[PDB]
Ligand binder design. Structure first.
Ligand code: 3PE
Ligand code: 3PE
Ligand code: 3PE
Ligand code: 3PE
Ligand code: 3PE
Ligand code: PLC
Ligand code: PLC
Ligand code: PLC
Ligand code: PLC
Lengths: 205, 75, 60, 90, 80, 49, 491, 77
């Protein structure tokens, strides 16, 4: 018998058992790593031609220097994203679906792999603090429901008959649990016991 | 309905009273000023109530159609 | 009553590529600047034109 | 004056009628406060017996002590949110 | 190739060189419209192209006027 | 905030080359598939450092 | 009547005070009569309005019925429905009573601009008083956040050496968190299409959606009643704000967060409140034990009282989340009793000592019972009340809150009993040091407590000991109101 | 008023330091040793006891169903 704790999670599209064909974790990271390497590598050479055309000009070198990537960054960035895409997809298959802790785990490690390359001359604690910080942002970005809840938004539930457009009533009790956005006047007591558990005033004293 | 224009006018007195402080003048300066600022907002207050009463008539009729549409949805 | 009225107004009907408002009140091509009858591909007849979809005024 | 409780149950009314729902909540509160008042009376009977019996308090105050320890868990204010929002039958 | 932003190497290092790139960029839009309009035998596309050429001219004149006054503003001693 | 704002202040400077380059980069958001947004979100966070 | 008379009169009073003071500004220098004696006439009109505000509510207290369940005195003003029930009535009474006392505390210890101060104090009191008598989450939030605008300016203008740090703390801590309370209020308006108290009390939500709304709201509450680890704003603001700002920020503002539980969590989120109550106890018990231990290592006089405020409010939250009438009534009596004892200490520490020696460091003060005996009688008397001595109103609140805590959870709720011991550690150490050994060699003999400062003390002690000796005055109002908050199904 | 307090230069430094310990604080291995104990170790330990017994203690009016005293005596001698 386990404990009863709250579940503060936004609704998600549940995948039926047997759904969720996994995606190639090697191939997916290969596209991002190779692709990002050519862009960052290609833009570097393009910015080198702009350096040759104008060097004595102060404003031109003022802006070109901002975009310049150190030799470590031109290598560290593609590796991190390639590591990020591999770990993000791999943890998606292990969980049978993308989760916040998977995205936290992928983002923090991938940052640590990347940060240890283009930020060598900094204490390892300084990197782990940054990598854990960047982990939280992807944990919260996934927990919040990506950029949009999509089908789980109240608008979608309302447009599907699962919203509170229909009012409430005490004489109509639903044996099954109500939807995420749905409200009711009265509930089956078995749902309260299966949530609160017996004890401190529920059923018994 | 005069009481509604009474409140709007009293808001007109406050703006002229609040104008005196910004200009840093005694609040009894140019007593005809309070009449002009009062009447200006009664003109606005008169029109504003006309606009809101017009909104009530329009919104009652629109809700008549929205209630019917919900019933078709709630079938 | 306020909760009812807001529930009516705040609701947004679903729009797909099947139902949406298009504000065209007539079929073009009745008269052209010149050579109105081209390759005779204008199968639309304006003498027996079916009624168009007039817009709904929800305040009327 | 002494207002009569509006004896009303959650199981016979429509919660859409928030006037009747109010009475169902007010009626379930008032009955509970009676049980505490009933409980405080029973405890008074126990106290007289123990003071009066002395050594015989275990005998002359046997069923009162038994009854008081039986009514104690349930003769307390519990509110109406428990029963309004839950359905024992289901 | 142009995904590495090669066109930035092809634009000179003067304000007047930016103005020309804007014209060459818009010129591509008009040529695209003339291409579609002629294939479709549609004169409405040719009306659009005529407007684009006329509007692209007014944009040049205002930009040059700002640039001209920008230039004389520095050379504004005129105390002789 | 002192670290973040010190980076953002360095970016606001009157320069045609800078603003033109930023705009053309943003055309990539129309080319890349939308599933690559989070990687661009990480790449942006890196160049802060 | 009530709110309409309470707003219209106060607005009229605020306009009247502004007209009188600013008339002479003009283009010429002015030496008028209203400036004489440090704006004394304008301070008096501010003090009368505070007294009149109390008379407005009493006009409606007479009509109150203790045997009626439901909101009374219901009225609609500004398209907002108001009303009073048992719990709200007493907190309104406390808020308005601290009006005259907050103004009287700062009678002659500001460098100037007394009219601005008097207007702000009466403005903050009205905003907080109105916060107990609204009947929707949106209007609750509006009044819950509007107090930042005067309080932020008041602390910045009239504060101590670190007033800029204190101003930047109250504004951001209490806004970056209450904005999380706005999100859960908004979601109530999206699914239910209404935020009215009664309408939302009857709806049950999915246990996942209950957990989200609770987390949002309790984030906004855990800052106002500072629970570790987000309490860092209160000690700083107290040590720097004006003395009158400290009386309101401790007397009332903290109790708005306990009233936040009564309206926003227990009735409508009853199922998820049961789940979080074990977690709430863990946070509050650790708040009780850590705040008491941290106080043992503090040096500023006015900070030391600030942390004592946190330990009591943790006990209040412990009691209110107990699912019985004993815990709820005890928590509310403690909030009322703390509402007088806490302001009294700041008067003793930041209002009587600080107005004579202008230094809050503890090292300078000892042996104060020699040349300031009347001060040391009240410091001793209020030290005991602050630590739950049985004859005060704090013991009734703490004993019941501890009793209710054990009833709800016998094992961990018993650790609330550490409040009786720890509260006597940091407090009695402070009093024993202040009134012990020889008189300090850094201070100079001066006046004892003045007649005004005695009046402030006597009328914060008198209500405290009435509630202690006969707490049934509070209870007879609370019982039917507090019995609607209990969630339990017994079969 | 008249500065009735003989202000001390050393007490002011002590008061200045004690109200500004945040500036000199570092997140060294010592702080993490303390930070882990107070923010995680204690809350989890109590958090387990709170949830373990949450509902397992029906102590209201608990009754006795087992004798206290012993009946027969079994001497060693
Ligand atoms: C003859 C060829 C000439 C040269 C060709 C190569 C040109 C050099 C440019 C680099 C190549 C990569 C970019 C090429 C176009 C962008 C990629 C694209 O269009 O999407 C296709 C590809 C995956 O496509 P796919 O999912 O298989 O589509 C079928 C689905 N059933 O999407 C991909 O994932 C491919 C890899 C792209 C990932 C790299 C970018 C990831 C993020 C790094 C940041 C890049 C810079 C950020 C700037 C953002 C500014 C806001
Ligand atoms: C592929 C080409 C290269 C990458 C281009 C990326 C284009 C998209 C960027 C969008 C914002 C435009 C920023 C303006 C252009 C910045 C160009 C740049 O990188 O300049 C470098 C600058 C700091 O320069 P510095 O490091 O001091 O000098 C380098 C010495 N070699 O570094 C910066 O100042 C960049 C940081 C600017 C602010 C970006 C932060 C955006 C917010 C992202 C975090 C959002 C977090 C929200 C939380 C929930 C989501 C996780
Ligand atoms: C989740 C938030 C995680 C933030 C990590 C902050 C922890 C930290 O402060 O690490 C310590 C170090 C600060 O330096 P210092 O205090 O001297 O550490 C002494 C170590 N010997 O920290 C550092 O040096 C760098 C840490 C900065 C990381 C901030 C990035 C957070 C962005 C997302 C916020 C969520
Ligand atoms: C002189 C005549 C004054 C105007 C009289 C009038 O027109 O009646 C309007 C109203 C009377 O009240 P009633 O109509 O019965 O319903 C409540 C609507 N306020 O009376 C009013 O509406 C006057 C109220 C205006 C003064 C209050 C301004 C509020 C300022 C913010 C308060 C902070 C709230 C948070
Ligand atoms: C300065 C003072 C500061 C504050 C004071 C601190 C102490 C207050 C907290 C302690 C409260 C008293 C101790 C709690 C247990 C006493 C109640 C009790 O008898 O528990 C018995 C109960 C079940 O009893 P049993 O029959 O044996 O179990 C089988 C059921 N079929 O359940 C049990 O079996 C309980 C098992 C033993 C109790 C474990 C927890 C004790 C508290 C440890 C806290 C450590 C810190
Ligand atoms: C130095 C001074 C400091 C401040 C002092 C306080 C001054 C208070 C003044 C009292 C005035 C009064 O009583 O206003 C009463 C009048 C009329 O009310 P009614 O007829 O019931 O209309 C219905 C009002 N309901 C809903 C309360 C019933 O409303 C007003 O004019 C409203 C003020 C104008 C607000 C701006 C909205 C209009 C512009 C729209 C562009 C966005
Ligand atoms: C119940 C709600 C009513 C609404 C009140 C609105 C405030 C506007 C008052 C203007 C009067 C004025 O500008 O006058 C100024 C007055 C009095 O200044 P003084 O000390 O006499 O003059 C000083 C100069 N001398 C002495 C040299 C002559 O100070 C005030 O303003 C105080 C109250 C407002 C401060 C906080 C405003 C925050 C607004 C947002 C709140 C949600
Ligand atoms: C405080 C936050 C409590 C939620 C923690 C949580 O959701 O728990 C830990 C989470 C999710 O972990 P998960 O693996 O998805 O959880 C279980 C997965 N199931 C269901 C498949 C088993 O992790 C994270 O990094 C969450 C990032 C924290 C975001 C904080 C946002 C706060 C906004 C408040 C809006 C009202
Ligand atoms: C001052 C700041 C304080 C912060 C507040 C901290 C409160 C922590 C709450 C403790 C909850 C607890 O103890 O729950 C314990 C749980 C479950 O344990 P289990 O292993 O499933 O139990 C097994 C039971 N058997 C062995 C008897 C079968 O653990 C967790 O999964 C932690 C989830 C909550 C944290 C995210």
């Amino acid at each position: 018998e386990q404990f009863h704790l709250p579940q503060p999670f936004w609704p998600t599209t549940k995948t039926k058992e047997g759904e969720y064909v996994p995606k190639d974790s090697i191939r997916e990271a290969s596209k991002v790593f190779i692709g990002s390497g050519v862009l960052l590598g290609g833009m570097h050479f393009r910015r080198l031609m702009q350096y040759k055309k104008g060097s004595a000009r102060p404003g031109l070198a003022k802006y070109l220097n901002l975009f310049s990537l150190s030799k470590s960054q031109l290598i560290g960035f593609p590796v991190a994203l390639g590591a990020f895409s591999f770990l993000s997809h791999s943890f998606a298959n292990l969980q049978e679906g993308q989760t916040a802790t998977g995205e936290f785990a992928a983002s923090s490690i991938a940052s640590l792999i990347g940060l240890s390359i283009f930020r060598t001359k900094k204490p390892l604690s300084s990197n782990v603090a940054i990598a854990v910080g960047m982990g939280s942002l992807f944990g919260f970005l996934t927990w919040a429901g990506n950029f949009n809840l999509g089908d789980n938004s109240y608008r979608a539930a309302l447009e599907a008959g699962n919203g509170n457009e229909g009012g409430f009533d005490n004489k109509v009790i639903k044996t099954e649990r109500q939807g995420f956005w749905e409200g009711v006047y009265r509930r089956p007591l078995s749902q309260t016991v299966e949530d609160l558990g017996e004890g401190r005033g529920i059923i018994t004293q | 309905m005069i009481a509604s224009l009474a409140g709007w006018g009293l808001f007109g007195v406050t703006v002229r009273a609040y104008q005196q402080g910004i200009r840093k003048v005694p609040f009894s300066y140019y007593p005809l000023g309070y009449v002009y600022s009062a009447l200006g907002w009664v003109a606005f207050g008169y029109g504003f109530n006309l606009w809101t009463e017009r909104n009530d008539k329009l919104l009652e009729k629109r809700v008549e159609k929205l209630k019917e549409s919900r019933n078709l949805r709630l079938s | 009553s306020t909760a009812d009225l807001y529930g009516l107004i705040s609701f947004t009907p679903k729009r797909d590529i099947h139902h949406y408002v298009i504000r065209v009140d007539e079929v073009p091509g009745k008269h052209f600047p010149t050579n109105t009858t081209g390759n005779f591909g204008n199968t639309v007849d304006f003498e027996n034109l079916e009624p168009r979809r007039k817009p709904i005024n929800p305040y009327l | 004056d002494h207002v009569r409780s509006p004896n009303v149950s959650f199981d016979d009314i429509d919660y859409n009628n928030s006037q009747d729902l109010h009475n169902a909540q007010e009626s379930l509160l008032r009955e509970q406060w009676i049980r505490v008042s009933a409980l405080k009376v029973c405890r008074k009977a126990l106290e007289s017996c123990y003071k009066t019996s002395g050594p015989n308090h275990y005998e002359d105050c046997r069923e009162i002590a038994e009854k008081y320890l039986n009514m104690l868990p349930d003769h307390r204010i519990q509110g109406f949110l428990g029963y309004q929002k839950n359905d024992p039958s289901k | 190739m142009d995904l590495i932003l090669l066109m930035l190497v092809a634009v000179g290092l003067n304000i007047i060189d930016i103005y020309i790139m804007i014209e060459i960029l818009i010129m591509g839009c008009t040529v695209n419209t003339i291409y579609s309009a002629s294939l479709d035998n549609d004169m409405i596309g040719l009306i659009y192209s005529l407007i684009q050429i006329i509007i692209a001219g007014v944009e040049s004149a205002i930009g040059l006027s700002i640039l001209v006054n920008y230039n004389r503003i520095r050379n504004s001693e005129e105390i002789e | 905030s002192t670290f973040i704002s010190s980076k953002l202040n360095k970016l606001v400077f009157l320069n045609i080359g800078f603003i033109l380059e930023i705009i053309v980069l943003s055309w990539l958001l129309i080319v890349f598939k939308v599933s690559l947004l989070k990687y661009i979100l990480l790449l942006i966070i890196f160049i802060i450092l | 009547m009530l709110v309409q008379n309470l707003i219209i009169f106060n607005i009229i009073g605020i306009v009247l005070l502004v007209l009188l003071n600013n008339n002479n500004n003009g283009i010429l220098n002015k030496k008028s009569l209203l400036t004489i004696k440090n704006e004394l006439k304008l301070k008096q009109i501010g003090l009368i309005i505070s007294i009149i505000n109390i008379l407005i509510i009493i006009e409606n207290w007479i009509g109150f019925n203790s045997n009626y369940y439901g909101f009374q005195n219901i009225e609609r003003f500004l398209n907002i429905y108001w009303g009073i029930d048992g719990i709200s009535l007493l907190l309104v009474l406390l808020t308005l009573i601290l009006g005259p006392i907050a103004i009287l505390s700062n009678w002659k210890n500001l460098k100037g601009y007394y009219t601005y101060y008097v207007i702000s104090i009466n403005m903050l009191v009205i905003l907080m008083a109105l916060n107990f008598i609204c009947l929707d989450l949106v209007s609750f939030y509006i009044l819950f956040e509007s107090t930042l605008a005067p309080l932020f300016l008041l602390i910045g203008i009239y504060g101590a050496n670190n007033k800029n740090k204190a101003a930047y703390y109250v504004l951001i801590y209490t806004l970056a968190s209450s904005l999380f309370m706005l999100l859960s209020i908004v979601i109530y308006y999206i699914i239910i299409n209404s935020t009215d108290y009664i309408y939302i009390n009857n709806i049950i939500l999915s246990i996942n959606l209950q957990s989200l709304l609770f987390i949002g709201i309790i984030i906004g509450i855990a800052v106002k009643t500072p629970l570790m680890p987000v309490h860092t704003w209160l000690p700083t603001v107290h040590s720097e704000s004006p003395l009158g700002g400290s009386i309101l920020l401790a007397g009332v503002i903290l109790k708005l967060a306990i009233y936040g539980v009564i309206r926003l969590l227990l009735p409508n989120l009853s199922e998820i409140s049961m789940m979080f109550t074990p977690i709430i106890y863990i946070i509050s018990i650790l708040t009780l034990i850590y705040s008491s231990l941290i106080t043992l290592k503090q040096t500023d006089l006015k900070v030391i009282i600030a942390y004592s405020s946190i330990s009591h409010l943790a006990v209040c939250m412990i009691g209110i989340f107990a699912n019985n009438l004993i815990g709820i009534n005890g928590s509310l009596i403690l909030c009322l009793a703390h509402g007088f004892v806490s302001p009294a200490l700041f008067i003793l520490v930041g209002g009587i000592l600080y107005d004579r020696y202008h230094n809050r460091l503890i090292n300078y003060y000892q042996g104060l019972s020699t040349f300031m005996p009347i001060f040391s009688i009240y410091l001793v008397v209020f030290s005991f009340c602050n630590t739950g001595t049985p004859l005060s109103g704090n013991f009734v609140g703490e004993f019941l809150s501890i009793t209710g805590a054990v009833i709800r959870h016998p094992i961990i709720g018993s650790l609330t009993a550490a409040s009786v011991l720890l509260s006597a550690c940091y407090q009695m150490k402070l009093t024993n040091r202040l009134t012990g050994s020889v008189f300090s060699q850094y201070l100079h003999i001066t006046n004892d407590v003045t007649n005004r400062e005695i009046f402030l003390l006597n009328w914060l002690l008198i209500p405290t000991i009435i509630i202690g000796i006969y707490p049934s005055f509070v209870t007879n109002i609370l019982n039917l109101a507090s019995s609607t908050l209990i969630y339990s199904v017994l079969i | 008023g008249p500065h009735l307090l003989r202000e001390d230069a050393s007490f002011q430094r002590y008061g200045q330091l004690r109200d500004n310990l945040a500036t000199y604080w570092k997140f060294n291995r010592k702080a993490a040793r303390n930070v882990f104990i107070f923010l995680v170790a204690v809350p989890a330990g109590l958090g387990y006891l709170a949830y373990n017994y949450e509902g397992k203690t029906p102590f209201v009016g608990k009754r006795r169903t087992e004798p206290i005293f012993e009946q027969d005596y079994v001497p060693r001698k």
